[PDB]
């Protein structure tokens with residue numbers, strides 16, 4: 246079995262070599278299967294494909310679509326149309342993207358067979374890693390994994406995030422014993438409907454088995470950071486449970502009590518140890534004191550999660566940060582072939598079996614923007630670029646055809662070719678296009694921010710005052726982070742504006758933001774209350790003065806809706822007068838509002 250572990254790792258690696266070497270043959274083979282299997286579906290037939298399966302006809306005939314283009318089809322399916330609308334296979338469920346249309350979560354169709362390709366990509370992760378850090382099979386992994394809120398569409402189909410349906414699927418719930426997926430969190434502890442009990446029991450099991458832990462993490466840095474904050478707010482009770490060997494009576498779930506009972510045993514010496522480390526004024530490096538055998542931290546810190554690297558580096562004492570894979574609700578994408586690289590060097594290799602990948606060349610106005618446009622010498626020729634044909638150093642937007650009824654759908658991700666593994670390109674992740682604010686899974690764009698602020702400023706009309714200018718940033722100085730707005734008012738009124746109405750503005754912004762933002766505030770507690778900081782009169786003029794000094798024409802300058810440049814955020818913060826916070830949670834409820 247030690248041997249058949251090595252054999253298995255050698256095979257998964259040889260698969261990487263074969264699929265990256267044969268990537269176009271695979272991409273052609275995948276497409277040919279999707280259009281063969283789905284030739285009589287309504288969507289393809291309606292576009293005149295006539296059951297043709299060749300890449301050349303497919304690119305020439307099918308339109309490149311956004312989610313809003315195909316919403317009719319998706320909504321009919323989510324209303325119970327069980328005909329072969331987009332897929333020849335029944336849509337098993339809908340996977341709810343964190344990206345939104347109309348403030349509501351986008352509904353990505355999937356089919357049951359897609360669970361295999363997802364496990365396939367997961368199955369690549371430890372074989373790759375074991376190359377660089379051997380011996381992880383002799384240990385456990387402390388990962389805080391969580392199910393999230395879940396819904397039913399009008400037609401009856403489930404609607405839930407990928408990981409929720411993955412964690413509940415047979416592929417995970419009854420998974421075969423893998424010594425590389427030997428976690429300190431028991432299943433029933435992850436599958437717990439109650440998120441507090443789920444976090445409480447996972448932390449207890451992590452501390453209980455603290456010396457077996459060779460890696461820690463969560464899916465996102467934000468989530469793992471919230472678990473450290475939890476240990477900070479709950480270590481006396483947890484130590485007490487370890488000491489007495491009994492689980493807090495507040496843990497109701499009998500699944501969990503049973504599960505925790507297998508691990509938890511009275512350990513006064515371990516309680517003393519937890520306490521002595523948590524009691525220290527500094528938590529710098531506490532991860533490697535509590536879990537001293539930890540070899541790395543397994544959290545995504547690419548994309549907007551990059552803001553969390555310093556807080557991570559503080560708690561881990563500069564342990565390596567490891568970003569293993571890249572994926573979405575519509576499709577699992579690729580693998581990091583160099584897991585021990587610096588976060589700003591991470592490249593993802595798309596596995597050509599997951600879907601048929603296409604690439605639309607894009608051009609950004611700077612390296613800092615999440616805003617797109619189309620090159621001059623490049624939306625009439627939607628004869629895009631194929632996987633093997635992307636060029637080193639160029640940026641593209643990601644396009645995907647999936648087994649489950651997406652044809653040439655724009656994911657909305659911007660990638661940059663950083664290199665190649667054999668013939669398969671490796672992408673550095675740039676951004677999800679138009680996102681300007683993000684703490685956890687929430688992804689707010691400028692349009693949403695703008696319309697939220699337009700709603701908010703109506704509370705000022707009674708007082709004969711207005712918003713001259715504003716900007717925002719994502720404040721991660723606290724756990725959880727929050728959105729900050731900088732407001733400069735114009736006051737032409739003789740009733741002073743009571744503080745309650747600035748709070749009314751914070752709430753009104755929050756209520757206008759999408760349902761992922763609101764679910765974060767209401768359910769996930771992944772986002773703290775919005776803040777509005779009022780700045781001295783003249784502040785945005787002083788900004789514009791910088792811009793002009795540096796080359797800008799006045800009749801063209803526009804105050805950015807969002808800023809992430811630390812020195813400019815620091816300047817704005819220097820001219821703050823007061824700050825106001827949302828006084829309660831916005832409204833959120835599971836599902837689309839129509840339901």
Ligand SMILES: O=C(Nc1ccc(Nc2ccc(Cl)nn2)cc1)c1cccc(C(F)(F)F)c1
Nearest residue numbers: 367407408416417420426464570571572573574
């Ligand atoms: O899934 C992701 N990371 C992940 C990695 C390992 C494990 N651990 C497992 C898995 C399977 C089994 Cl069988 N055992 N252990 C769990 C989750 C991921 C990554 C990037 C984006 C997204 C998405 F949400 F945006 F799609 C998801």
Ligand SMILES: Nc1ncnc2c1ncn2[C@@H]1O[C@H](COP(=O)(O)O)[C@@H](O)[C@H]1O
Nearest residue numbers: 342343545547548570571572573574677
């Ligand atoms: N490893 C990663 N690094 C940066 N961003 C990621 C990564 N994985 C997923 N994402 C982002 O999250 C999206 C998927 O969101 P969702 O559909 O909500 O699961 C992707 O399309 C990317 O925008």
